[PDB]
Amino acid sequence: ALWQFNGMIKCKIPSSEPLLDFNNYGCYCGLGGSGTPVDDLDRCCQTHDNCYKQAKKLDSCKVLVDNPYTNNYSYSCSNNEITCSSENNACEAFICNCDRNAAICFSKVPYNKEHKNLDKKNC
Amino acid sequence: ALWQFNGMIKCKIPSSEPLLDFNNYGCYCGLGGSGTPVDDLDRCCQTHDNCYKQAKKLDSCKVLVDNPYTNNYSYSCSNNEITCSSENNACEAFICNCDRNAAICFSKVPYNKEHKNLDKKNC
């Protein structure tokens, strides 16, 4: 769920408030997304969005009532590293992996304030 | 919370259904407890019960509305090892540690079926 995603990003970037720093960035960081990513951080979000799209094609994810945003999973943050838990069933484990990869990606690319609240006429 | 405790014990003992195997064992394994522990597994539960008693004396635990049984925390199981997450605030982190120690203890001591549903006239 989004609140585990928030925690994961804070696990990799301790000084960040993810929902504030990463929401509405470029063409992909935020709900939805379309167009050509404006930079690498935007590209991280595009991959993450694609990952969630894959998750929805999974039969395991089809039986659940929760969508990737509300579907809770278990993970731990220890020494700034994310570990998806073996207690997650197939769907939640897939989502957990998507979120983990995106958090690490965010932590490895440049942040361009100029792309915050990017006008969607470039997407 | 109890459901994280259940998962933790299954993390260390994969073939077990904890709520069935460990509830109502000896004088301490189960709600409450009193008397002299009947064996080492019972002793594990006595330490765990003492741990929860410590948790309640914590000011951090006092402000919460959830008791140790309903207080949710985050942990992961990976390769049969338990990791309490840095995302836990003081209270939940204390509880997480109590549960982790008890799961490991359970996994290291003998299980005596003769003590299952032990008559509380020995406690």
Ligand SMILES: CCCCCCCCOC[C@H](COP(=O)(O)OCCN)OP(=O)(O)CCCCCCC
């Ligand atoms: C209830 C209000 C909360 C809305 C703010 C978060 C936007 C949605 O995040 C989910 C997705 C992706 O899901 P979708 O964009 O809806 O599309 C997924 C299918 N492609 O992540 P993202 O890669 O777009 C970047 C999120 C970072 C912001 C910080 C949140 C912790």
Ligand SMILES: CCCCCCCCOC[C@H](COP(=O)(O)OCCN)OP(=O)(O)CCCCCCC
């Ligand atoms: C809603 C019904 C569920 C009840 C069954 C579990 C009993 C309570 O477990 C909590 C405590 C300890 O809390 P208390 O005994 O109530 O006393 C704590 C303060 N001393 O653990 P324990 O060390 O006594 C052993 C639990 C193993 C059983 C499997 C559960 C996953």
Ligand SMILES: [Ca+2]
């Ligand atoms: Ca998006």
Ligand SMILES: [Ca+2]
């Ligand atoms: Ca007990």
